[PDB]
């Protein structure tokens, strides 16, 4: 059963650069059995190149294949942005056929520090019984960030559940979410309340917090 | 040319049982066109379930037993039909569902290795929720506060819900988050708007038309 | 090793210099002879597929009999569109050769021998042969005549079954014989012989197989709804003249059937040409009896596909797109490049 | 596209393949009942309705074009047709409209009309005196000669007229 291991995760490419997305197999694929295809997002994946250099009838001369043994790559030339989207390699040298990790090709843009928000449990949501913290971050770059939630000063873990936006058509920006999902108890149980987040463009670490 | 047409939206409860199918308009046969059930986990990378080639049903050893592609040829009221069979659902197969198909005619072609290829034509997808949690709507609380304020969709089933901001008078600075699957088999998301105002949630699956205001 | 390819072939038959009848002529001119010891090399643990619609050959062939029709039955009187062209029209003597197709240098046949094959999908039987076998040039329409019998079922063939307006072959298993004659001392009137007993036992055959194809719905038969007489009715060439058989009773679910049926067949001088958009007239049909004894291999179907109820199924006869007779008989093959 | 036509009247649709030659082609209605079509050279019709009162002009086949002819419409003729030619799939919506006077006091022109239109009828009387409505046009006086009525119905205005009488 043959592993598909794409790299990277995810890179950063302007409109006319030239993507290198590469993809290596557990064994050596002799046959050069191998496909990449493009998904946009809510939308079919699209097949690309066939037989590790083979491209297919319709699709643009600016994909390229590369094929050598375990290491394939998937070379995209004057990009553009329809070419922005997650690209996955497949093997079909042998049964059954095994997908990459993938790799999401998003728009490069200029570093931007987010924008914390916090917000107390509504008061209906209270009287529901149960309670969400929801510290906020507006739009930044890159996606990477961590956010953590002290409460009275003390991490917790679990009862957390962040969420990300798509990047945005215009901004070319993320916007994330994170709430912390406690019972009313617990909630009352606790003074202090704080969103604490760290990010390469706040060049500081931001607690934003309230107490009630 | 080819269309692949899949079959609406299952929701069904673990141990149960679903049966999908796949319309391959414009496919002369079977015969020349191998057909290949793979399926997508939210947020997932794509994994192949098996597949139908010279009328000759497979699936991964990760299904096997659990899954029954079968496939009957074109006839004169319909195209030719492929369907996938799951037995034994659980949470885990909560993926969206493709059938895809391709050409096997042309033996020296780089698109398949005996049995073993890759997928030319995609489906439109079909979703398979798994879950125990019975079709519920959402409760709708406002978070209210250059400022931030949002409105938060939570414990509805099954997805999706629609929402919007000032009856869709308000488009800009307005992040409507993706639903997160809650610890307690519920979906839950939220839509923050940015301003220096109501929420309209619409889940239809619940026939709930709740807005409500912020402030 | 090879790989299909769309090559120029070239005719082989037995034709014999001293004959007068045209087709003779031509492939003696055209074609070279058969071989003598031809060999059929069975290719082991090789599936290869095949798809008989988009068979090059059928098309190659299409233009060999446009070109034997056109040396061999020269109208008297051409009206294309507005013009009108004069020329000379002897009556020949017509009575259809074998012709074998075969494949230059670098190329090959491949031939499947499936025994219940419908043209398209794998044949887990392919063999590999320098010519096909020999086929007439039989022009015919609603009946298939003089064919290559299938071997052991009704076979159902169509480019397309859930597209009504796709032609339906039908592959018989025994062939149906048609006796038609225009006696000797109307001399434009005449009627074909077909017992009864034989076509009706063949087209209850008929309908189970296509009740396997379409649902086990219950399968009419009609006679063509409208269209050219060359299409409404079965026509085909016996001796030079060109005959049109009015085919309404043959097709109907009416099974005292044990009768013989006589079918009124009418000799016509003035007719559509097959040949491509074209009418043609001839001289009169000849003196004394004229006699075309045939075999019914084949027939040629048209499915209405109300696509509004699944109540019943109605097929009328057709098929004026000849290329569909070459396809009838070259199915079985394709041409390689090795 | 939609094309509209007068009750007995004769309407001709477009079909036109990409390559200048003959290939197979087939006119079908909505419910994909055959009307007209081509086996090599030769013309068949379909079971539809129109067996006669369709044809084809075989000059164009070659061309490339493949017409689909329908003289002496009538109401029920009324549907979308579809001209498959291999890789073309292209269709077209017909209607037509018949405009009958009660008779041959009050007048009152009813438009026979087919299902699911939405009917604008304007009437010029002699002396040029206009009139609007639906399917029914009403006038309750006597003015009587070759009135003129134009049909409207998806931005395509068709024409008719009518005599009538008096006392
Ligand atoms: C031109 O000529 C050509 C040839 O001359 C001709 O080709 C022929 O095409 C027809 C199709 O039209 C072919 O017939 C079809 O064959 C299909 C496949 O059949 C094989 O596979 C199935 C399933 O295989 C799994 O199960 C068995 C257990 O018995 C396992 O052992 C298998 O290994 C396999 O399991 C593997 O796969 C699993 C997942 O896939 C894995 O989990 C597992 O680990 C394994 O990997 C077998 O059951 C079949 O065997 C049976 O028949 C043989 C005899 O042939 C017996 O020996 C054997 O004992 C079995 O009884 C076989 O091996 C069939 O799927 C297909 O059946 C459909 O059509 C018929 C009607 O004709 C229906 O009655 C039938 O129900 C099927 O319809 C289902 O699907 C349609 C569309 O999807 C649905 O609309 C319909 O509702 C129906 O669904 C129902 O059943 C589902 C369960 O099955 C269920 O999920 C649904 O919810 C619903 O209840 C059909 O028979 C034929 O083989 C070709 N001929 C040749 C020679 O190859 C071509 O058509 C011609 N073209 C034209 C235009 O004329
Ligand atoms: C044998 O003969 C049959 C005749 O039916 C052919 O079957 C038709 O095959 C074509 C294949 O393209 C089909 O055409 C496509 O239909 C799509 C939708 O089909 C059904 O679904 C919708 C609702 O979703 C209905 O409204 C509709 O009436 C149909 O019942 C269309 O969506 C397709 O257009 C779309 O596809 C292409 C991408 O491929 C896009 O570029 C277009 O923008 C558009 O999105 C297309 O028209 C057709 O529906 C089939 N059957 C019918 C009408 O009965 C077979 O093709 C033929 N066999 C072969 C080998 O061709
Ligand atoms: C379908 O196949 C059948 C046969 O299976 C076929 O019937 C055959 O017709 C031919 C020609 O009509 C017959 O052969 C002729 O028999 C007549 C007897 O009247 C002879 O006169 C013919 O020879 C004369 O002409 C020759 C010149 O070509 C001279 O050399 C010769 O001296 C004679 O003057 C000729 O032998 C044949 O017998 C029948 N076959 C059977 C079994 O009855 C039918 O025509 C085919 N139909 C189609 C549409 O293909
Ligand atoms: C081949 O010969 C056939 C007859 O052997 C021809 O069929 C005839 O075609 C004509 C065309 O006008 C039809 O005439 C019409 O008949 C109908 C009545 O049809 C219904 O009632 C009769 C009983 O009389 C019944 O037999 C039918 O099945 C129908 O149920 C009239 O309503 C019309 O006004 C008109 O007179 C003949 O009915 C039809 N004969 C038969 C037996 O169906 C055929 O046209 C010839 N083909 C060619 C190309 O010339
Ligand atoms: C083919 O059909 C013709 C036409 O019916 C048959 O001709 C008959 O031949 C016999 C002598 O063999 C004559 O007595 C009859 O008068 C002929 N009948 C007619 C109508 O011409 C001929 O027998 C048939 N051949 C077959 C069935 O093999
Ligand atoms: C158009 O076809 C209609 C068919 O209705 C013809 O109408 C018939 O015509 C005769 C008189 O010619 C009447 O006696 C019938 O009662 C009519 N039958 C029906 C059903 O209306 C009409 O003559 C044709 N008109 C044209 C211009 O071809
Ligand atoms: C269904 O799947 C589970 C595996 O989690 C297994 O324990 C159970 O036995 C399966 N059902 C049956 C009937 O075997
Ligand atoms: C397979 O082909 C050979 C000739 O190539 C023939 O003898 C044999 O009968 C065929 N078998 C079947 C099942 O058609
Ligand atoms: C219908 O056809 C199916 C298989 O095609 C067969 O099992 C069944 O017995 C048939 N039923 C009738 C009434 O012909």
Same mark, same amino acid.
């Given at each position: 059963?043959?592993?598909?291991?794409?790299?990277?995760?995810?890179?950063?490419?302007?409109?006319?650069?030239?993507?290198?997305?590469?993809?290596?197999?557990?064994?050596?694929?002799?046959?050069?059995?191998?496909?990449?295809?493009?998904?946009?997002?809510?939308?079919?994946?699209?097949?690309?190149?066939?037989?590790?250099?083979?491209?297919?009838? %319709?699709?643009?001369?600016?994909?390229?294949?590369?094929?050598? %043994?375990?290491?394939?790559?998937?070379?995209?030339?004057?990009?553009?942005?329809?070419?922005?989207?997650?690209?996955?390699?497949?093997?079909?040298?042998?049964?059954? %056929?095994?997908?990459?990790?993938?790799?999401?090709?998003?728009?490069?843009?200029?570093?931007?520090?987010?924008?914390?928000?916090?917000?107390?449990?509504?008061?209906?949501?209270?009287?529901?019984?149960?309670?969400?913290?929801?510290?906020?971050?507006?739009?930044?770059?890159?996606?990477?960030?961590?956010?953590?939630?002290?409460?009275?000063?003390?991490?917790?873990? %679990?009862?957390?559940?962040?969420?990300?936006?798509?990047?945005?058509?215009?901004?070319?920006?993320?916007?994330?979410?994170?709430?912390?999902?406690?019972?009313?108890?617990?909630?009352?149980?606790?003074?202090?309340?704080?969103?604490?987040?760290?990010?390469?463009?706040?060049?500081?670490?931001?607690?934003?917090?309230?107490?009630? | 040319?080819?269309?692949? !047409?899949?079959?609406?939206?299952?929701?069904?409860?673990?141990?149960?049982?679903?049966?999908?199918?796949?319309?391959?308009?414009? !496919?002369?046969?079977?015969?020349?066109?191998?057909?290949?059930?793979?399926?997508?986990?939210?947020?997932?990378?794509?994994?192949?379930?098996?597949?139908?080639?010279?009328?000759?049903?497979?699936?991964?050893?990760?299904?096997?037993?659990?899954?029954?592609?079968?496939?009957?040829?074109?006839?004169?009221?319909?195209?030719?039909?492929?369907?996938?069979?799951?037995?034994?659902?659980?949470?885990?197969?909560?993926?969206?569902?493709?059938?895809?198909?391709?050409?096997?005619?042309?033996?020296?072609?780089?698109?398949?290795?005996?049995?073993?290829?890759?997928?030319?034509?995609?489906?439109?997808?079909?979703?398979?929720?798994?879950?125990?949690?019975?079709?519920?709507?959402?409760?709708?609380?406002?978070?209210?506060?250059?400022?931030?304020?949002?409105?938060?969709?939570?414990?509805?089933?099954?997805?999706?819900?629609?929402?919007?901001?000032?009856?869709?008078?308000?488009?800009?600075?307005?992040?409507?988050?993706?639903?997160?699957?809650?610890?307690?088999?519920?979906?839950?998301?939220?839509?923050?708007?940015?301003?220096?105002?109501?929420?309209? !949630?619409?889940?239809?699956?619940?026939?709930?038309?709740?807005?409500?205001?912020?402030? | 090793?090879?790989?299909?390819?769309?090559?120029?072939?070239?005719?082989?038959?037995?034709?014999?210099?001293?004959?007068?009848?045209?087709?003779?002529?031509?492939?003696?001119?055209?074609?070279?002879?058969?071989?003598?010891?031809?060999?059929?090399?069975?290719?082991?643990?090789?599936?290869?597929?095949?798809?008989?619609?988009?068979?090059?050959?059928?098309?190659?062939?299409?233009?060999?009999?446009?070109?034997?029709?056109?040396?061999?039955?020269?109208?008297?009187?051409?009206?294309?569109?507005?013009?009108?062209?004069?020329?000379?029209?002897?009556?020949?003597?017509?009575?259809?050769?074998?012709?074998?197709?075969?494949?230059?240098?670098?190329?090959?046949?491949?031939?499947?021998?499936?025994?219940?094959?419908?043209?398209?999908?794998?044949?887990?039987?392919?063999?590999?042969?320098?010519?096909?076998?020999?086929?007439?040039?039989?022009?015919?329409?609603?009946?298939?005549?003089?064919?290559?019998?299938?071997?052991?079922?009704?076979?159902?063939?169509?480019?397309?079954?859930?597209?009504?307006?796709?032609?339906?072959?039908?592959?018989?298993?025994?062939?149906?014989?048609?006796?038609?004659?225009?006696?000797?001392?109307?001399?434009?009137?005449?009627?074909?012989?077909?017992?009864?007993?034989?076509?009706?036992?063949?087209?209850?055959?008929?309908?189970?197989?296509?009740?396997?194809?379409?649902?086990?719905?219950?399968?009419?038969?009609?006679?063509?709804?409208?269209?050219?007489?060359?299409?409404?009715?079965?026509?085909?060439?016996?001796?030079?003249?060109?005959?049109?058989?009015?085919?309404?009773?043959?097709?109907?679910?009416?099974?005292?059937?044990?009768?013989?049926?006589?079918?009124?067949?009418?000799?016509?001088?003035?007719?559509?040409?097959?040949?491509?958009?074209?009418?043609?007239?001839?001289?009169?049909?000849?003196?004394?009896?004229?006699?075309?004894?045939?075999?019914?291999?084949?027939?040629?179907?048209?499915?209405?596909?109300?696509?509004?109820?699944?109540?019943?199924?109605?097929?009328?006869?057709?098929?004026?797109?000849?290329?569909?007779?070459?396809?009838?008989?070259?199915?079985?093959?394709?041409?390689?490049?090795? | 596209?939609?094309?509209?036509?007068?009750?007995?009247?004769?309407?001709?649709?477009?079909?036109?393949?990409?390559?200048?030659?003959?290939?197979?082609?087939?006119?079908?209605?909505?419910?994909?009942?055959?009307?007209?079509?081509?086996?090599?050279?030769?013309?068949?019709?379909?079971?539809?309705?129109?067996?006669?009162?369709?044809?084809?002009?075989?000059?164009?086949?070659?061309?490339?074009?493949?017409?689909?002819?329908?003289?002496?419409?009538?109401?029920?003729?009324?549907?979308?047709?579809?001209?498959?030619?291999?890789?073309?799939?292209?269709?077209?919506?017909?209607?037509?409209?018949?405009?009958?006077?009660?008779?041959?006091?009050?007048?009152?022109?009813?438009?026979?009309?087919?299902?699911?239109?939405?009917?604008?009828?304007?009437?010029?009387?002699?002396?040029?005196?206009?009139?609007?409505?639906?399917?029914?046009?009403?006038?309750?006086?006597?003015?009587?000669?070759?009135?003129?009525?134009?049909?409207?119905?998806?931005?395509?205005?068709?024409?008719?007229?009518?005599?009538?009488?008096?006392?």
């Amino acid at each position: 059963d043959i592993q598909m291991t794409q790299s990277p995760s995810t890179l950063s490419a302007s409109i006319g650069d030239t993507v290198r997305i590469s993809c290596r197999a557990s064994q050596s694929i002799t046959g050069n059995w191998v496909a990449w295809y493009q998904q946009r997002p809510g939308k079919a994946p699209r097949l690309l190149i066939y037989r590790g250099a083979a491209l297919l009838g %319709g699709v643009p001369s600016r994909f390229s294949g590369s094929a050598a %043994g375990t290491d394939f790559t998937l070379t995209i030339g004057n990009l553009q942005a329809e070419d922005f989207g997650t690209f996955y390699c497949q093997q079909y040298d042998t049964y059954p %056929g095994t997908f990459g990790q993938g790799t999401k090709v998003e728009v490069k843009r200029t570093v931007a520090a987010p924008s914390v928000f916090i917000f107390p449990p509504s008061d209906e949501q209270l009287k529901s019984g149960t309670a969400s913290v929801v510290c906020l971050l507006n739009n930044f770059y890159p996606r990477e960030a961590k956010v953590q939630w002290k409460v009275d000063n003390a991490l917790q873990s %679990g009862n957390s559940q962040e969420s990300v936006t798509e990047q945005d058509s215009k901004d070319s920006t993320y916007s994330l979410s994170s709430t912390l999902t406690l019972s009313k108890a617990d909630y009352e149980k606790h003074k202090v309340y704080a969103c604490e987040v760290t990010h390469q463009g706040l060049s500081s670490p931001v607690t934003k917090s309230f107490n009630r | 040319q080819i269309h692949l !047409v899949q079959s609406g939206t299952e929701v069904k409860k673990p141990g149960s049982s679903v049966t999908v199918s796949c319309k391959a308009y414009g !496919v002369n046969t079977f015969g020349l066109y191998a057909v290949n059930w793979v399926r997508q986990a939210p947020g997932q990378s794509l994994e192949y379930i098996g597949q139908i080639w010279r009328w000759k049903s497979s699936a991964s050893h990760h299904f096997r037993g659990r899954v029954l592609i079968s496939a009957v040829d074109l006839t004169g009221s319909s195209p030719p039909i492929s369907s996938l069979e799951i037995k034994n659902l659980t949470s885990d197969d909560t993926a969206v569902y493709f059938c895809t198909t391709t050409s096997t005619y042309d033996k020296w072609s780089g698109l398949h290795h005996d049995g073993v290829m890759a997928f030319s034509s995609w489906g439109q997808g079909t979703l398979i929720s798994v879950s125990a949690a019975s079709t519920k709507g959402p409760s709708v609380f406002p978070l209210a506060p250059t400022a931030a304020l949002g409105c938060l969709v939570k414990d509805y089933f099954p997805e999706p819900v629609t929402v919007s901001w000032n009856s869709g008078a308000l488009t800009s600075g307005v992040h409507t988050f993706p639903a997160v699957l809650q610890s307690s088999g519920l979906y839950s998301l939220s839509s923050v708007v940015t301003v220096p105002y109501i929420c309209n !949630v619409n889940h239809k699956p619940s026939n709930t038309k709740v807005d409500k205001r912020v402030e | 090793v090879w790989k299909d390819a769309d090559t120029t072939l070239f005719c082989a038959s037995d034709a014999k210099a001293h004959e007068t009848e045209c087709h003779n002529v031509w492939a003696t001119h055209a074609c070279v002879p058969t071989d003598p010891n031809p060999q059929e090399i069975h290719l082991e643990q090789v599936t290869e597929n095949f798809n008989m619609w988009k068979n090059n050959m059928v098309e190659q062939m299409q233009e060999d009999v446009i070109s034997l029709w056109d040396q061999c039955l020269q109208p008297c009187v051409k009206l294309t569109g507005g013009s009108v062209i004069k020329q000379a029209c002897p009556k020949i003597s017509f009575d259809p050769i074998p012709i074998h197709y075969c494949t230059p240098a670098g190329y090959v046949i491949l031939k499947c021998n499936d025994k219940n094959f419908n043209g398209t999908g794998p044949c887990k039987n392919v063999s590999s042969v320098q010519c096909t076998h020999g086929i007439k040039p039989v022009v015919s329409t609603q009946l298939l005549l003089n064919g290559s019998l299938a071997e052991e079922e009704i076979i159902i063939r169509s480019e397309n079954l859930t597209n009504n307006a796709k032609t339906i072959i039908v592959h018989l298993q025994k062939s149906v014989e048609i006796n038609c004659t225009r006696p000797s001392n109307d001399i434009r009137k005449a009627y074909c012989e077909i017992q009864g007993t034989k076509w009706n036992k063949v087209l209850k055959q008929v309908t189970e197989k296509l009740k396997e194809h379409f649902n086990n719905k219950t399968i009419i038969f009609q006679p063509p709804s409208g269209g050219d007489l060359e299409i409404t009715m079965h026509h085909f060439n016996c001796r030079g003249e060109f005959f049109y058989c009015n085919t309404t009773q043959l097709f109907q679910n009416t099974c005292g059937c044990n009768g013989t049926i006589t079918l009124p067949c009418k000799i016509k001088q003035i007719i559509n040409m097959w040949q491509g958009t074209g009418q043609a007239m001839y001289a009169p049909p000849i003196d004394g009896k004229i006699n075309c004894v045939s075999q019914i291999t084949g027939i040629l179907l048209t499915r209405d596909g109300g696509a509004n109820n699944t109540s019943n199924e109605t097929f009328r006869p057709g098929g004026g797109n000849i290329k569909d007779n070459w396809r009838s008989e070259l199915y079985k093959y394709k041409v390689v490049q090795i | 596209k939609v094309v509209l036509g007068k009750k007995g009247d004769t309407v001709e649709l477009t079909c036109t393949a990409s390559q200048k030659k003959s290939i197979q082609f087939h006119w079908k209605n909505s419910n994909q009942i055959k009307i007209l079509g081509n086996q090599g050279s030769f013309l068949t019709k379909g079971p539809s309705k129109l067996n006669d009162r369709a044809d084809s002009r075989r000059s164009l086949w070659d061309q490339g074009n493949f017409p689909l002819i329908i003289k002496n419409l009538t109401i029920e003729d009324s549907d979308t047709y579809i001209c498959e030619v291999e890789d073309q799939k292209e269709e077209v919506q017909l209607l037509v409209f018949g405009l009958t006077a009660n008779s041959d006091q009050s007048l009152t022109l009813t438009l026979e009309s087919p299902p699911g239109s939405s009917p604008s009828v304007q009437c010029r009387s002699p002396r040029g005196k206009n009139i609007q409505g639906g399917k029914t046009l009403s006038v309750s006086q006597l003015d009587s000669g070759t009135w003129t009525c134009t049909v409207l119905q998806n931005q395509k205005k068709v024409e008719f007229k009518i005599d009538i009488v008096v006392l």
